[PDB]
Design a protein around this ligand. Sequence first.
Ligand SMILES: Nc1ncnc2c1ncn2[C@@H]1O[C@H](COP(=O)(O)OP(=O)(O)O)[C@@H](O)[C@H]1O
Ligand SMILES: Nc1ncnc2c1ncn2[C@@H]1O[C@H](COP(=O)(O)OP(=O)(O)O)[C@@H](O)[C@H]1O
Ligand SMILES: Nc1ncnc2c1ncn2[C@@H]1O[C@H](COP(=O)(O)OP(=O)(O)O)[C@@H](O)[C@H]1O
Ligand SMILES: Nc1ncnc2c1ncn2[C@@H]1O[C@H](COP(=O)(O)OP(=O)(O)O)[C@@H](O)[C@H]1O
Lengths: 442, 437, 93, 442, 445
Amino acid sequence: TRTAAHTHIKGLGLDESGVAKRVEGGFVGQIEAREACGVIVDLIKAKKMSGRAILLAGGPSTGKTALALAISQELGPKVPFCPLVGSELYSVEVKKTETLMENFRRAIGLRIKETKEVYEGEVTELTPEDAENPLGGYGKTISHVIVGLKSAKGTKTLRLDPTIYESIQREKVSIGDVIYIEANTGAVKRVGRSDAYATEFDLETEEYVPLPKGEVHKKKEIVQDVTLHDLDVANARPQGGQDVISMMGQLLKPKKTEITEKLRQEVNKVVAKYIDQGVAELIPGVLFIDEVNMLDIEIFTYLNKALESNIAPVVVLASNRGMTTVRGTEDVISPHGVPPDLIDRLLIVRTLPYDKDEIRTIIERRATVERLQVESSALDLLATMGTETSLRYALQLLAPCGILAQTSNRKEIVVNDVNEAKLLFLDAKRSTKILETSANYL
Amino acid sequence: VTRTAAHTHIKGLGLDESGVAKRVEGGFVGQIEAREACGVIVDLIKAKKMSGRAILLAGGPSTGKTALALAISQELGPKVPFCPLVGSELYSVEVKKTETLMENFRRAIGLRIKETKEVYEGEVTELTPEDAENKTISHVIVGLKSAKGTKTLRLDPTIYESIQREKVSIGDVIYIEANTGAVKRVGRSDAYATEFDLETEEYVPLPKGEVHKKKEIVQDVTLHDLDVANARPQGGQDVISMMGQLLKPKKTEITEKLRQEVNKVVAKYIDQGVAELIPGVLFIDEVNMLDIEIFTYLNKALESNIAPVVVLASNRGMTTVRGTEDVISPHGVPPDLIDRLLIVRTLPYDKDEIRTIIERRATVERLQVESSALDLLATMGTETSLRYALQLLAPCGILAQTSNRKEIVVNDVNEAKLLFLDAKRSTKILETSANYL
Amino acid sequence: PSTNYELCLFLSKLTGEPSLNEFFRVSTTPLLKRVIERTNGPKNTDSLSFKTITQELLEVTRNAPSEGVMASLLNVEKHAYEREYLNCIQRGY
Amino acid sequence: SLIAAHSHITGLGLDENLQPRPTSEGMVGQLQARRAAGVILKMVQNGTIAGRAVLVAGPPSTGKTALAMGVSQSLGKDVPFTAIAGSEIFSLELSKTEALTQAFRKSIGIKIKEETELIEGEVVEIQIDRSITGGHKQGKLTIKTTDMETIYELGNKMIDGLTKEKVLAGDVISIDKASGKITKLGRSFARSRDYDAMGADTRFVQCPEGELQKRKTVVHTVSLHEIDVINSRTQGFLALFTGDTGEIRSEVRDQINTKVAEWKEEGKAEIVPGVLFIDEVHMLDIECFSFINRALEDEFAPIVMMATNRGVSKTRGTNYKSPHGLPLDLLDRSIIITTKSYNEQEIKTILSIRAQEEEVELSSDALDLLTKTGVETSLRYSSNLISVAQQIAMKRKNNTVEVEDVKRAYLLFLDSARSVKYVQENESQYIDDQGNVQISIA
Amino acid sequence: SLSLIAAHSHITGLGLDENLQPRPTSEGMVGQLQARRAAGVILKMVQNGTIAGRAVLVAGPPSTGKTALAMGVSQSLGKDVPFTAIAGSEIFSLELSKTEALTQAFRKSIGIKIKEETELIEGEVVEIQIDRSITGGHKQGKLTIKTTDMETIYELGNKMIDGLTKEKVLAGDVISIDKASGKITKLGRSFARSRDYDAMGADTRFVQCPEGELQKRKTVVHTVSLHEIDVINSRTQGFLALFTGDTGEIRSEVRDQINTKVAEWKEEGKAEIVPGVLFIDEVHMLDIECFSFINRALEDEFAPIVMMATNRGVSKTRGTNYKSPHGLPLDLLDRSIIITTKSYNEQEIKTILSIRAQEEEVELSSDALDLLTKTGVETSLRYSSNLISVAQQIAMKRKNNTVEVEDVKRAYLLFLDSARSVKYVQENESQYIDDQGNVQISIAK
Ligand SMILES: Nc1ncnc2c1ncn2[C@@H]1O[C@H](COP(=O)(O)OP(=O)(O)O)[C@@H](O)[C@H]1O
Ligand SMILES: Nc1ncnc2c1ncn2[C@@H]1O[C@H](COP(=O)(O)OP(=O)(O)O)[C@@H](O)[C@H]1O
Ligand SMILES: Nc1ncnc2c1ncn2[C@@H]1O[C@H](COP(=O)(O)OP(=O)(O)O)[C@@H](O)[C@H]1O
Ligand SMILES: Nc1ncnc2c1ncn2[C@@H]1O[C@H](COP(=O)(O)OP(=O)(O)O)[C@@H](O)[C@H]1O
């Protein structure tokens, strides 16, 4: 078990058709922001809209990323979620517009149901039966291939096409191997050798797979979850070109290229065609961009362009700046570092700072998650610590308090332990104070 | 007739066995304290114990910082590696600058490997491959022959593959290296030169010496050579390719994993006694051209366990550091790096040692200068600059030679001063004139 | 492998190569010669080399008939070739 | 697909006299700009006028891109419409002028007529002769209809298309000769001898009658940029989707221009022009503006529509300010369409259209409150509030959206001015332009 | 053997007790008791391995031992634990973005331990007898592998024969074959069968014939970082990019798939996660984009403990135009804990100088140690530490073993510190090139 300043956040914690409980789901306070995020989660689950932008605005250490992760856990693992930093779009292999568009396409998922009818198992015989009056000038003209497959409780003799036989030569299928044939394509697949057929007792490099379970003939419905960016990446590269430059690019570094809009529209129209047949289901997800103040003005204008498309997902933005200059500009003072046209294109959810009791309950919840026992007086001192200093400093001081408690052979965290941890590790404000007082290039 | 560069006249630091600098010795005159400090530095290098030691040579222009660096280079010898570099060379457009600095760091740590070279040279008399199947040849019996006699060898099928690569037949003088396995076809012998009156064969003589020749050699490599030997995005350094490969290999950021593996292999070979480790010198002239990021990576890389002795040169004073905006620092070097340096101060000269520098450069370039012409050149060196006289020495010799004289006279110095200008006179002409000189 | 057997064993545990001499052979061959001579059939299952999702979608449609949903979702370049009549377009340059 | 911001616009809403209706085809108001856009659309549909610059100017949230999407919807099919933003030009693998040239040539279409033989019939016999390694492939195909039966010679590509989607005898298939398309219509024989290999369940198709070969003329549109990318290198068709078309030489462009002029003069092909729309055209550099100035004077130059929402602003790449962010030599070559703001009634009609498109039922007083909020703050803010108010109303288990749902959505999600006021009242809680913030509560 | 004496070679770890209380002088670390106790608390958190992504900022004036404390933490951490010490300037690259370089630095500092069991048959090949099958399937072979002591016969399958014919192994070749996995190697040619050929081949390597038991059991523990798995799964032949370094911006979906597969391999127990420390020395030389990516990347469960070192005061953050404490923005300092290092008094300077002189095998006299301590208190620790070795060379040129006062005084006269060089430059400013480029090379007017 590992904790990473999260994983106490288990969803948002709203009840059905109602007001958020104050302490529920690892969340303390932020009732209006959690209600707005629940409304956004229901809008995403409605599966109807495209390119809706929410900006989480508040101070530092107020729970914007916690709310985004709560949205992601409320949506479930099947709905796609792409976390992102504003600094990640400045790639040096491809232009920043292409990175933004591929992160947009990474947050649109496709669920495809399909039927696989297969014959698999350990093989018993391979008789390429010759035809009567077998032409002339050729040896062993095959009328059909008889393959005897066996598995757990099942044994089936199959009369295959002659043209599978060269595939038999292709995958090096011998008697005693565990093979796998799809009915629609008729392509064999040598999984390995049976465990009972380990004849070479001394030295062998074969992969001995167990004998597969169930009947030989199995027809099953499987569900595959992909993203639209996966389809774009798989369709961009030459799929089995079998030429010199294809293997050259296979062996080379996979450099990122500007995926054209034509390929995206082709993928979109084939996806819509298979959606109309009912075999595929489209799900939109969340592209979360934290600290969008690091985005360039070109990123903001391309965001204005790309939010109007019919495909784009719900984009959750976060920012902690209040009234600052937009990156890429020199005199554009804007709220949250976001230009007014994009600000016009989104909805703003405000996040509030916390109180003493909320900070105390957050510290106690983090102590219970990290499996640390803190007494009440040390908890009150940590709450006063989190009010005088930052909340994150009091949250991150819990683990040194646990180390200093366990080094004295006790499980409770004592006021002496948190005083020692205060003396050992410094706050940002106290470090700034001793940087101002000391003029020795500290 | 040998050419003469700017630092040709300097052969060493000119110190005695006690380390005290003789005044005029080794191509130097004056600058005794910095020469003694550089002698202490080369004693530290010859100790072969320390790593990451850094010395900065600080002084004015034309005072001898680069002269002392090349004097260190001749004092150590060609066995010790020496990597001269400019601070401008670290700005590469193929790889990042810290990677280039670390590559130049690894270029100044060398290895001596004693090895044998055994060569079979001569004309093939018999080429019988024995198969002994178990299609595939067991071995090949090859009979070479030179003017001192013949010799028979048994060769593995890899050398037979290399022999059939070279289209070797009976009667061809060929070359075989026993250790490497390289096969080179020198060409057909003249004993078979009259089989046809005209053919594309190149007819070479029989070797006059013995067939088998063995000698001892030493291989001087660096750690950067072994780094780039086994870090190739597209391999194939072994095959001889006159034409280039179809895809141009680019310089890449070599990871620390390859450095640790190369260090482990080198330490294993050193522990066997095969290889000897020679720490060397990385010299960076004009260190004020380094970016602050390169200064930070230099701060990090000077604490390595395999870092060489680094010698920096600078001629600036209280100057802003490159890549910064308001960091006024001595010699253009940030104060965190300066704390790790040892600073050797380089003094200016006066008239007498300027005159002896001029006469030493005249003696090295084989020019005869008259005494009053030497005094005029020394006065001009004190007035304009020392390098102005050092660069006007050769036009004086040319103007003397065109007048059929082997002795430089005062009129030659006046004519060379009239024809060629220094920086101050050209700046005065620049200031007085209006339309772009 | 004579001097650095531990690194070869580590790389064989990582990649799953059945031969420990594959790394020395690959590192000392030309890249085009390596591209021509890559016919490798078996791989070790007990390895850290993993089969990606997109590579699985490549493998299922290596030999697959048309009108299957997985087959047609990953074969769109051929569909764009066929529907734009690029089989009979004349050369211009 | 999904509901985007311009999904309600199905055209321009103009009569045959180029007169705009007050509300038609999802467009309401902006009569002079709609009439000017209809004039531009008729100029595009004429096709004899090349390289005209059109600028659409106005404040934000007014309808410049709405007018461009109305032009695109009224443009018709097989006419190119390349809608890009100003940030796509700045690339790492292409120059600005080369990216602009590719955007210009993506907007010019070439309508090519091809002659095609359609061969539909039952397969009697397939004979395929392949080499030992499988490289060289040839053979014969005996095909049949109810009148006559022929034997054709198969090439490599036709056999490759026959192996995939495996054609047996008795299968009714269709052969497109000009495209190499193999379409298995089905199976007509239903032989008693059935193999155990295949899982094919092909439907019964009646035996095709009539002639076997049918001649037809097909018509397809290919952009200019596709022809330069295809003719630029060997595997240019891969580069049409990967976008690895790095700086195509001018010799290729000149030869493609001469070849398409020869195709026009032969009657084989015709050239149709399209529209290059550039949203946020102020983001382009002065070098891009100079290249646009000289590239508008070409024969193969499309109609260029540009949209910007900026007044006298700083032109990028320079040190001065210009109207619309564009230099005066570019504005000399352009005719400017001006778009004006809306009143209460136009905002109410836009919100009613957006609610009808989003399947959201609004009451009269809820629509009045949304209209008042759109007038006070922004039209985009109320149009975004519609969906979350619908989500709140569905959370309240009622079908329609009431006034209190709109008030709850207004209280939950902030606009620009309220967020600016909240930031200015709580300035110390946010990171300012100097990077100073007070995280601590006390 | 290859490593020479560096600036931090005398430090073998943090000199702490079992109660995390630092000794005054232990394991090469002198003083800094609060900083060493805090670093011991940091080490225990890394050793616990149950929490992730803590940012620790080591701050103080230069030459106080922030990097010394980091090397003490790395030495006390022990082997087979990923410690990645990088500088802030290495992030700025040409084919990798700053966030991608930071991701590769983060994922190089956390790995997995994997246990392997090897049944190795190592020996020289005597004879390979191949039972040629009529149909060609299941080609039986008889391997005569042989050590110095004893020799058996092994049965060989068809894929075994194909592996032994893929690489060219003959009689007299030393090979080892794994029984469990079928791994193939060729160590080279035995020395007993080395004189039969007059010239060796290009790939012919000569190795000693192994002794002892023919088949040996061994347990191998492999520590594979997450970046290693990313580079391996990024390409078809990805092991070359582990050494050449041209990984080239590994896509995200590979990293999520590898994270999920590492989680399920942990839950089925064939690998265990070993977290480590990423130490960014001079972290002030990073862009604000790097700081924001660090802020978001510290919140993942596969994140190491990040130790950052800075000697800056209230300095300008790179990429912006405002000043900030430590050269770091306030949201980065919010998610961090600060260990402050203080300056040294005379006794700590003397003890560190004596330890550094003992490390370099220099016999310092008492008066020379007092003079070096006075110079260290006056100028700097690193100036006296650099003066020790050149004073040793000065004394060795004087045919003396130990150093005296005269050797240290000669080294002080020959080599200048920062303040003396600043004084000599400021006294003669015309002889040096100014910030405006002006200089006076002429010595007379
Ligand atoms: N209401 C809350 N309840 C519980 N934990 C919270 C709450 N708000 C913030 N936190 C915790 O505080 C820590 C820092 O908050 P974070 O979301 O990183 O701030 P920011 O919004 O500036 O990114 C997170 O680990 C988060 O889990
Ligand atoms: N002490 C000296 N004795 C002899 N020659 C010298 C001395 N100092 C400098 N020189 C000569 O002066 C020339 C220029 O000096 P240089 O080392 O280039 O100056 P800098 O230190 O600015 O690089 C060199 O060719 C060198 O040979
Ligand atoms: N005449 C109109 N008819 C219908 N909707 C309109 C009209 N004008 C503007 N809109 C709506 O107003 C919103 C903003 O218009 P848009 O053109 O996208 O941005 P801008 O006007 O700032 O360029 C769009 O969502 C669009 O649907
Ligand atoms: N506590 C200590 N114990 C031993 N040596 C130290 C100590 N602190 C500093 N040093 C020595 O001082 C030198 C410079 O310290 P360094 O680690 O570079 O400090 P900083 O990183 O703050 O510049 C190092 O070479 C180290 O040997």
